[PDB]
Write a protein that binds this ligand. Structure first.
Ligand code: ZN
Ligand code: ZN
Length: 205
DNA sequence: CCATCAGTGTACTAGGACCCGAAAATTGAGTTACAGAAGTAACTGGTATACTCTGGTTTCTCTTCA
């Protein structure tokens, strides 16, 4: 919605990089899940025609654009004259952009999404008229879902690297086939591996 | 009747070559130096496969002693 703050769209973009759980759970897979990456790395920024609207709303937020502006303040790199902003003092109605031109939305460190303002139109009477739901999803992609590599009946909850049982190197397992292949009777890892929790992108996105 | 179990009708991948254009880089001529290395362009021996009388040979009647 025009005249609707930025960070009203940043908080709406469903990306699975917000739901990834950190750390490795090989020794014991019953650990209290570390906070999803939505909570740990709260920083993000839009880039709209030479101005990094940074999400400095929270204290855990740090300037992701500082890296780029420093990297460009060095040796000339094509780019030049980068700006900054705060993304809570801005609405889409205050923004000076091109249509159909790719801009940036970086979040979770370097999960980059290419933003394209396809068109701008005055609101009609036959579309949604609310605001409580308006940065709303017109279309999404319906990605594929990874499955457990042992039995192809359930989706992958775990991804293991350097597994001394897996044929493939990154091997995805459901919970059942993971518990059954790597753990003797009480949680002592059998063999060697690095198991991480796997958020299926084709499910939470 | 609620279990199960191929097919199906598709956008969504997965390899798998392959192409289209752009931008950067080179090539090319022009000069004038510089030293040295390629790069043909030229006359001038040197030793073998035919080769041409020729020196010897060979019966074959004869020459010359004996
Ligand atoms: Zn993302
Ligand atoms: Zn499984």
């Amino acid at each position: 919605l025009g005249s609707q703050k930025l960070t009203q769209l940043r908080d709406s973009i469903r990306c699975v990089s917000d739901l990834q759980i950190g750390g490795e759970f090989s020794n014991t897979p019953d650990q209290a899940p570390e906070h999803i990456s939505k909570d740990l790395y709260k920083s993000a920024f839009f880039y709209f025609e030479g101005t990094f609207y940074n999400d400095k709303r929270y204290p855990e937020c740090r300037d992701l654009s500082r890296t780029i502006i420093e990297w460009s303040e060095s040796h000339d790199r094509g780019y030049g004259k980068f700006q900054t902003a705060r993304m809570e003092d801005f609405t889409f109605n205050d923004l000076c952009i091109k249509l159909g031109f790719p801009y940036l939305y970086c979040h979770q460190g370097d999960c980059e999404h290419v933003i394209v303002i396809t068109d701008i139109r005055l609101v009609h009477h036959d579309d949604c008229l609310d605001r409580t739901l308006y940065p709303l999803l017109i279309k999404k992609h319906w990605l594929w879902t990874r499955k457990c590599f042992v039995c192809k009946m359930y989706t992958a909850r775990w991804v293991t690297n350097n597994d001394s049982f897996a044929p493939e190197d990154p091997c995805f397992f459901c919970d059942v086939c993971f518990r059954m292949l790597h753990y003797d009777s009480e949680g002592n890892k059998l063999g060697e591996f690095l198991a991480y929790p796997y958020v299926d992108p084709g499910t939470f996105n």
